[PDB]
C-alpha cells in the first residue's frame, strides 16, 4: 500500500496495548529491561482442529519470531520433514515458524510485515493461517498453499 514514509517503527510501549484488546492471552511480559515483548495463548485453527500454544517475540530493530511449543509437533510429524521452519530458537523451546517474507527479496523495499503494523494485526492471523495449512499437509502429502520460490542459489538468510 502506497503510504507516506513519515510513519516510523513504533516503540515497545505502543505495541504493548495492542495485544490486550484482542483475544485471550495467558501472559504479556516485558523483559530485558523493556527490550522484549512476549505473548502466549491458545489458538484453534478450526472447529474440529487441535489445541495449539503460540509464542511471539520481538525487539526493536529485529524481525519478530513466532514459536509454537505445545504440542511437540514432531511426534505428530513422524520424523518426516515438516515444511516451512526457520532455524531453531535456542532460548525458547519448540519449532519455529516462518510466516512472512524478509526485506531482501522484496523489491519495493517494503516487507510484507513491517514495524508500522501492530503485532496483533497480522502475526497471529498468519500463524493461525499457518496452522490451518499444516494439518492439511498431512492426509494429503502435499503443501496445498502458497509455496516458496524454487530458489536456484539464494539462501534467504
Amino acid at each position: 500500500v502506497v503510504i507516506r514514509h513519515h510513519c516510523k517503527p513504533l516503540t515497545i510501549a505502543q505495541q504493548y496495548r495492542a495485544l490486550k484488546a484482542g483475544g485471550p492471552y495467558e501472559r504479556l511480559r516485558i523483559i530485558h529491561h523493556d527490550r522484549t515483548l512476549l505473548w502466549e495463548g491458545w489458538l484453534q485453527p478450526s472447529l474440529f482442529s487441535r489445541r495449539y500454544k503460540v509464542a511471539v517475540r520481538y525487539s526493536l530493530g529485529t524481525p519478530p519470531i513466532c514459536v509454537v511449543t505445545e504440542p511437540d509437533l514432531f511426534a505428530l510429524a513422524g520424523t518426516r520433514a515438516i515444511p516451512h521452519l526457520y532455524p531453531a530458537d535456542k532460548h525458547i523451546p519448540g519449532a519455529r515458524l516462518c510466516l512472512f517474507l524478509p526485506r531482501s527479496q522484496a523489491d519495493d523495499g517494503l516487507s510484507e510485515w513491517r514495524a508500522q503494523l501492530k503485532i496483533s494485526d497480522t502475526l497471529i492471523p498468519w500463524a493461525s493461517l499457518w496452522l490451518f495449512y499444516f494439518e492439511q499437509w498431512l492426509h494429503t502429502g502435499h503443501w496445498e498453499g502458497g509455496g516458496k520460490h524454487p530458489r536456484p542459489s539464494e539462501v534467504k538468510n
Partner: protein, 373 residues
C-alpha cells in the same frame, strides 16, 4: 463422546458435510430430462402399435426415480431407471400376449432392437454409458377402492402379483412436505435422510461376507421405515435444531415399525395391504430369511456407531479420514478440494477473518497477503 453430546455448531457442520457429499451422487436436471425424453419416445413408439392388446399403453416412472431419491451406484457407471407400462385393454389379457406384443414392437425399431435385453420380470434397453431403462408390464385391478392405482404386475413365478406404485409415491410426497417445528431462541429433508442411509448401507455392504452382502437391507424397506419414523416425530411435535439429531432420532425409531404376526414379519404398503415389502424375510427356507432380519439390526447398530465414531474425532485430518471411511473417499475428495478453493479465494478476496475467542479462521479482520514464505 457421543454424537448427541456435541454442541450445535459441530453437528450442523457435520450435517452440511453430509449434504454436500450426497449432492455429488445425485443426478442432475439435464440428465433427468434426457431420460424423460428417452422413455417418452419409447412409450410413443409403443402406442403406435396396431395390435389391440398393446394399444393405449402409457409409461410413467417408478421406484427411486419417481420419489427423487436416486444415489449413484458405486463402481457402476450406469444409473438405474425402472418404469411400468399400463394397458387398459389388458384387463383380462394373457401373459404371453403382452410379452409378445412388447417384444415384437421393441424389436421393430432400428435403434431400439440392438440395445434390447431380456430381463426375468420384463425388458431392458441398454442405453450406452450412463443410465438404464427397465420396463414392467401391468394389468389394471378392479374391486379395491383406495387413493390411487390398484394394479397387477408381472412376477415370473406367479405370473401376476399385486402392486400399487402411485399410491406409495403420493403418500411419500404428502409426508415429506411437512417440516418439523424448529426451536426458537432468545430436496426435502426426508429425501436427504433416505439418501444418506442408502449411501451408508452401500458403504457397509462391501466389507461384509457374501451372506451379509446378499441379505443387505433393501431400499424400499428403509424408505418405508424412515417415512414411518418421520411421521411419528412430526406428529409428536418434538423440536429439533441439531441436524444429525433428526437423523439419529429417525434411525432409532426405525426398528419399532417392523410388525410380527404369527411368526410372519409384515412391512406393508400403507395403501395396499397386500403389498409385502418384507416377503423374503418371512420365508425361512435354509434360514435365508432369518439372516436378513439380523442384517438389518447389525446395520442399524453400525450406523448408530458411525456417528459416535465421527463425533470422537479431533483434528481436521481425522475428521476427513473418518468421513472417507464412512461415505467413500471419492465423494469426500471433491468437498475438501472445494473447501480449499474457497479458502484460497477468501485469502485473495480478503474475507478471511480471525475469531476473537479462539483465533479460528472465518471464511466468507481481513488477513493480509502471502502468509507463507
Amino acid at each position: 463422546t457421543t454424537a448427541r453430546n456435541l454442541p450445535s455448531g459441530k453437528k450442523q457442520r457435520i450435517a452440511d458435510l453430509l449434504s454436500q457429499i450426497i449432492e455429488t451422487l445425485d443426478l442432475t436436471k439435464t440428465q433427468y430430462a434426457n431420460i424423460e425424453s428417452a422413455y417418452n419416445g419409447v412409450g410413443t413408439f409403443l402406442s403406435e402399435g396396431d395390435d389391440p392388446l398393446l394399444q393405449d399403453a402409457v409409461i410413467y416412472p417408478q421406484g427411486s426415480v419417481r420419489l427423487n431419491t436416486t444415489v449413484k451406484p458405486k463402481n457402476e457407471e450406469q444409473y438405474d431407471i425402472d418404469l411400468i407400462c399400463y394397458l387398459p385393454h389388458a384387463t383380462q389379457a394373457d401373459y404371453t400376449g403382452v410379452i409378445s406384443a412388447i417384444r415384437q414392437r421393441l424389436e421393430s425399431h432400428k435403434t431400439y432392437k440392438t440395445l434390447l435385453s431380456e430381463l426375468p420380470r420384463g425388458f431392458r434397453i441398454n442405453y450406452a454409458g450412463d443410465y438404464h431403462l427397465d420396463i414392467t408390464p401391468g394389468r389394471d385391478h378392479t374391486g379395491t377402492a383406495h387413493p390411487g392405482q390398484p394394479l397387477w404386475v408381472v412376477d415370473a413365478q406367479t405370473a401376476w402379483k399385486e402392486s400399487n406404485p402411485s399410491g406409495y409415491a403420493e403418500w411419500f410426497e404428502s409426508s415429506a412436505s411437512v417440516q418439523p417445528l424448529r426451536t426458537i431462541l432468545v430436496k426435502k429433508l426426508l429425501n436427504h435422510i433416505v439418501q444418506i442411509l442408502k449411501r451408508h448401507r452401500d458403504e457397509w455392504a462391501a466389507e461384509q461376507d457374501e451372506v451379509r452382502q446378499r441379505c443387505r437391507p433393501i431400499s424400499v424397506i428403509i424408505t418405508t421405515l424412515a417415512c414411518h419414523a418421520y411421521n411419528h416425530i412430526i406428529a409428536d411435535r418434538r423440536a429439533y435444531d441439531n441436524d444429525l439429531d433428526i437423523l439419529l432420532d429417525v434411525l432409532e425409531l426405525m426398528p419399532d415399525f417392523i410388525v410380527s404376526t404369527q411368526g410372519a414379519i409384515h412391512v406393508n404398503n400403507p395403501h395396499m395391504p397386500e403389498e409385502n415389502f418384507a416377503e423374503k424375510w418371512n420365508r425361512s427356507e435354509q434360514d435365508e430369511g432369518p439372516q436378513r432380519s439380523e442384517a438389518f439390526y447389525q446395520w442399524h447398530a453400525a450406523a448408530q456407531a458411525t456417528f459416535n465414531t465421527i463425533a470422537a474425532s479431533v483434528g481436521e485430518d481425522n475428521l476427513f479420514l473418518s468421513l472417507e471411511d464412512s461415505f467413500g473417499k471419492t465423494p469426500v475428495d471433491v468437498v475438501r478440494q472445494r473447501l480449499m478453493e474457497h479458502m484460497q479465494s477468501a485469502r485473495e478476496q480478503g474475507s478471511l477473518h480471525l475469531d476473537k475467542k479462539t483465533g479460528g479462521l472465518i471464511a466468507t479482520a481481513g488477513v493480509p497477503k502471502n502468509t507463507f514464505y
